[PDB]
Write an enzyme that holds these catalytic residues in place. Structure first.
Site, PDB file in Angstrom:
ATOM      1  N   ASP A  35       6.309  -0.102   6.060  1.00 26.07           N
ATOM      2  CA  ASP A  35       4.937  -0.179   6.583  1.00 26.07           C
ATOM      3  C   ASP A  35       4.249   1.174   6.494  1.00 26.07           C
ATOM      4  O   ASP A  35       4.451   2.026   7.371  1.00 26.07           O
ATOM      5  CB  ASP A  35       4.989  -0.621   8.033  1.00 26.07           C
ATOM      6  CG  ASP A  35       3.605  -0.718   8.616  1.00 26.07           C
ATOM      7  OD1 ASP A  35       2.648  -0.770   7.798  1.00 26.07           O
ATOM      8  OD2 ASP A  35       3.485  -0.688   9.879  1.00 26.07           O
ATOM      9  N   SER A 199     -12.661   4.268  -0.957  1.00 24.67           N
ATOM     10  CA  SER A 199     -12.958   3.548  -2.189  1.00 24.67           C
ATOM     11  C   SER A 199     -14.408   3.806  -2.597  1.00 24.67           C
ATOM     12  O   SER A 199     -15.279   3.959  -1.717  1.00 24.67           O
ATOM     13  CB  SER A 199     -12.696   2.048  -1.993  1.00 24.67           C
ATOM     14  OG  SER A 199     -13.101   1.290  -3.044  1.00 24.67           O
TER      15      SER A 199
END
Ligand SMILES: NCCc1ccc(S(=O)(=O)F)cc1
Length: 330
Positions: A35, A199
């Site tokens: 994770d 992004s």
């Protein structure tokens, strides 16, 4: 040093991925959920409340010649989905894919929430976010990657998750055979303890690319892609009959649909998520409503590039002094 381990989806939906991890001496192999959104290595154990164990393999420190109680240390964690676990701590030898760390903090669960008990395939978590998020008190502990880092040939690990197929986690090297084209690297903020990046924008299907900054985290421990409501509405508007359902808890679509792809930007590069990757199948067994793999991050307080996005790429988690993320097509 390097390590290389295969990671395997837990079910036909790719809800999560498990990777075998050797703990203790002789080795006890547990299948952990790697994770990148958390920083605790915790396991089902001989200490876990018996009613909260249902099929998991447990770590038994008393059977490990190398296990030491980390006296007075406790831990307690809560995840974005409302699940949680807590317990006490041992140090032991931990190996992943042939890479060994001695003295790793192995957080032994006394309690886990129902979501963990009900998932028999996941024997615990191995956190790969920054060690500043580790929950051990009163002495915070390091992640497996942070403990391994100085030994590794290169201070990196890579995630190469499969779509309905096994993939690979590598530590200490970048497998240049595992991706196509070049890797595009992007800056990381460690301010919140996550692999947080920005992004450069998105496109829906064959539509025009929208240049827009989307901060979010690269999170192998989150199944879906969680993005701003504007972006998610623009995606599902291209699917006839899709809607947000408050009863179901997100966007659903007719199972008869063909889903468009979703593109996200990494600098000037583009990663394309095929439409198939965004299908999470019937909402309940036999239903003709299907659950979407792109959901709104509204209320979560962060955007999350979970496995739906990451499995479309070869992803480099560069843990050098200035951390960066890299993405390549594959
Ligand atoms: N970064 C998210 C970590 C996480 C949180 C919850 C789970 S679950 O198996 O309870 F759904 C799994 C992994």
């Amino acid at each position: 040093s390097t390590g290389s381990a295969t990671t395997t989806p837990i079910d036909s939906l790719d809800d999560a991925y498990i990777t075998p991890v050797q703990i203790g001496t002789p080795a006890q192999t547990l299948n952990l959920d790697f994770d990148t959104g958390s920083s605790d290595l915790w396991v089902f154990s001989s200490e876990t409340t018996a009613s909260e164990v249902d099929g998991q393999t447990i770590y038994t420190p008393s059977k490990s010649t190398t296990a030491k109680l980390l006296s007075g240390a406790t831990w307690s964690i809560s995840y974005g989905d409302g699940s949680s676990s807590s317990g006490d701590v041992y140090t032991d030898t931990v190996s992943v894919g042939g890479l060994t760390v001695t003295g790793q903090a192995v957080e032994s669960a006394k309690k886990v929430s129902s979501s963990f008990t009900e998932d028999s395939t996941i024997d615990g978590l191995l956190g790969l976010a920054f060690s500043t998020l580790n929950t051990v008190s009163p002495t915070q502990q390091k992640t497996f990657f942070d403990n391994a880092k100085a030994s590794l040939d290169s201070p990196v690990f890579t995630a190469d998750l499969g779509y309905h197929a096994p993939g690979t986690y590598n530590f200490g090297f970048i497998d240049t055979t595992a991706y196509t084209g070049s890797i595009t690297y992007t800056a990381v903020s460690t301010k919140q303890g996550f692999w947080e990046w920005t992004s450069t924008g998105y496109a829906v299907g064959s539509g025009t690319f929208k240049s827009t900054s989307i901060d979010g985290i690269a999170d192998t421990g989150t199944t879906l892609l969680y993005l701003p409501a504007t972006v998610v509405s623009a995606y599902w508007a291209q699917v006839s009959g899709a809607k947000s359902s408050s009863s179901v808890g997100g966007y659903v679509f007719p199972c008869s649909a063909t889903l468009p792809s979703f593109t996200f930007g990494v600098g000037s590069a583009r990663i394309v998520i095929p439409g198939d990757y965004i299908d999470f199948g019937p909402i309940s067994t036999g239903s003709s409503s299907c659950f979407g793999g792109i959901q709104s991050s509204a209320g979560i307080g962060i955007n999350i590039f979970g496995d739906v996005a990451l499995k479309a790429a070869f992803v480099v988690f560069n843990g050098a002094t200035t951390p960066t993320l890299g993405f390549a097509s594959k």
